[PDB]
From Swiss-Prot, chain A:
Histone methyltransferase that specifically mono- and dimethylates 'Lys-9' of histone H3 (H3K9me1 and H3K9me2, respectively) in euchromatin. H3K9me represents a specific tag for epigenetic transcriptional repression by recruiting HP1 proteins to methylated histones. Also weakly methylates 'Lys-27' of histone H3 (H3K27me). Also required for DNA methylation, the histone methyltransferase activity is not required for DNA methylation, suggesting that these 2 activities function independently. Probably targeted to histone H3 by different DNA-binding proteins like E2F6, MGA, MAX and/or DP1. This is Histone-lysine N-methyltransferase EHMT1. The chain holds residues 1009 to 1266 of 1298 of the full protein. Residues 154-171, 231-234 are annotated as: Interaction with histone H3. Residues 118-232 form the SET domain. It is found in: Nucleus; Chromosome. Widely expressed. Zn(2+) 2 binds at C54, C67, C97, C101. Coiled coil: none annotated. Zn(2+) 4 binds at C192, C245, C247, C252.
Length: 255, 257
């Protein structure tokens, strides 16, 4: 146990680092931030009046939920999991309820905002360096963790030498560079049959340039499984020239 | 006794704050929006550049005097239970710099208190002769963080044109430019705290996740033991409003009676 909790206790649960392959110490070239941060001034519309909100007097589980309507439909169930209706292959924007809404803090449409609740562990992989794995069975359609880091412009992103920790938001483009600041997500490797899917979300602000990226389970993840998502194409078109996917799956497109 | 609301905070706080009425027939106040955190309507440019943060490199629980954060606040004024030391100057309180996400230390170090939230058992209640008030339901040790004064961030320009100024609080006194918190349209339990000439609460300026020195946050600490059932109060600032409203705190030394 090279680290008992890489998050210095900021998260709800501890995320320990372990190594039983090589003799590398707990990674420490970065700053663990549990929430997104900015260096450059990024003007985000935190005008409260500009918030779309709902006036529900239920637990926002009726279809009168404005917040639910904005997201086409409240996609959450009673256990805070996605409905089987949820389009995994082309996910919609989700608008969770916010401090502007009339409803209570425990209504159905508050999930990603509550934080990560899963048991994760940073561990050393045989062939990919560091990786993240669950220590517990994860039901399908469960919110695992948020992709968090630094907010940068496409301008800023192109001049960045190290681009291995980036994530394109909307296509003007903004980015998250998890290189210098990030959370557990920065250590998640790629996979061609992924058990994780990114979903764009809005909570306390609805500035549509700056969605937050939540990973949901695409299937059951068994305790001990390593997480993975599809990095996309720009990665494996250039970086694929140098590296190569070693997901170890029958349908590896970038082997 | 009518429990007119089981929790005025819709569960945003760590504990529920219920409203009760056992004097007149007024329903739970509702011309405002309970926000647990400070908000802005107008764009207020606050420096949330992470690199602009002063931070510490403690590897302890920030209880050594090497604590940069502690140094900035002259001294970590907190004890192990998160209460102020008896050394704390009640009559002239310093700026406090709590530890932030930039620091090297853990989230449970000594110098994180106001940031953790309100933990005490409070209750919005109807007073006989002051309208609404806030009351503790439990003994409060002296030097305990009670609640934060929270609302809308507005300029002195904006504040002067505001008709209703009963819910204001001056932050950055002079320094060329002054900002305010107007708890009128958005606020928390603090907006209901009445004045008192022998106050059991004191405001203390604090910095946590940002150190933009125009925009301190205002934390109330207990100046003494508050017994379960006592109403809270602080000294407002009467300067003008006192030109007809006469204080009914009901203390022997009421200066605005
Ligand atoms: N499925 C995969 N197969 C091979 N290399 C991968 C991979 N997913 C990520 N990587 C490598 O991971 C690098 C950094 S991103 C992930 C962090 C890295 N695993 C670490 O040890 O900290 C990339 O440069 C990429 O080459
Ligand atoms: N010591 C005091 N005696 C009487 N009224 C007071 C008081 N301190 C504050 N108030 C009243 O509190 C008003 C608004 S601020 C606090 C809210 C107030 N308790 C309410 O009835 O909602 C002031 O305008 C003033 O009239
Ligand atoms: Zn809701
Ligand atoms: Zn709703
Ligand atoms: Zn809502
Ligand atoms: Zn592959
Ligand atoms: Zn600290
Ligand atoms: Zn320190
Ligand atoms: Zn510190
Ligand atoms: Zn008085």
């Amino acid at each position: 146990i090279v680290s008992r909790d890489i998050a210095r206790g900021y998260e709800r649960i501890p995320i320990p680092c372990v190594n039983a392959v090589d003799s590398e110490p707990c990674p420490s070239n970065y700053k663990y931030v549990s929430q997104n941060c900015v260096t450059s001034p990024m003007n985000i519309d935190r005008n409260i009046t500009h918030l779309q909100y709902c006036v529900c007097i239920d637990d926002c589980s009726s279809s009168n939920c404005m917040c639910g309507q904005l997201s086409m439909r409240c996609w959450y169930d009673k256990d805070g999991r996605l409905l089987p209706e949820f389009n995994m292959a082309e996910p919609p924007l989700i608008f969770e309820c916010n401090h502007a809404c009339s409803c209570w803090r425990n209504c159905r449409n508050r999930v990603v905002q509550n934080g990560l609740r899963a048991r994760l562990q940073l561990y050393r992989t045989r062939d990919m360096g560091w990786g993240v794995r669950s220590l517990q069975d994860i039901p399908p359609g469960t919110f695992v963790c948020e992709y968090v880091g630094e907010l940068i412009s496409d301008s800023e992103a192109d001049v960045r030498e190290e681009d291995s920790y980036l994530f394109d938001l909307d296509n003007e483009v903004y980015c998250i560079d998890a290189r210098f600041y990030g959370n557990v997500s920065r250590f998640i490797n790629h996979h061609c049959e992924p058990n994780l899917v990114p979903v764009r979300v809005f909570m306390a602000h609805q500035d549509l340039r700056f969605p937050r990226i939540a990973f949901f389970s695409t299937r059951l993840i068994e305790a001990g499984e390593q997480l993975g998502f599809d990095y996309g194409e720009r990665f494996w078109d250039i970086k694929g020239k140098l590296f190569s996917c070693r997901c170890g799956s029958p349908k590896c497109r970038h082997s």
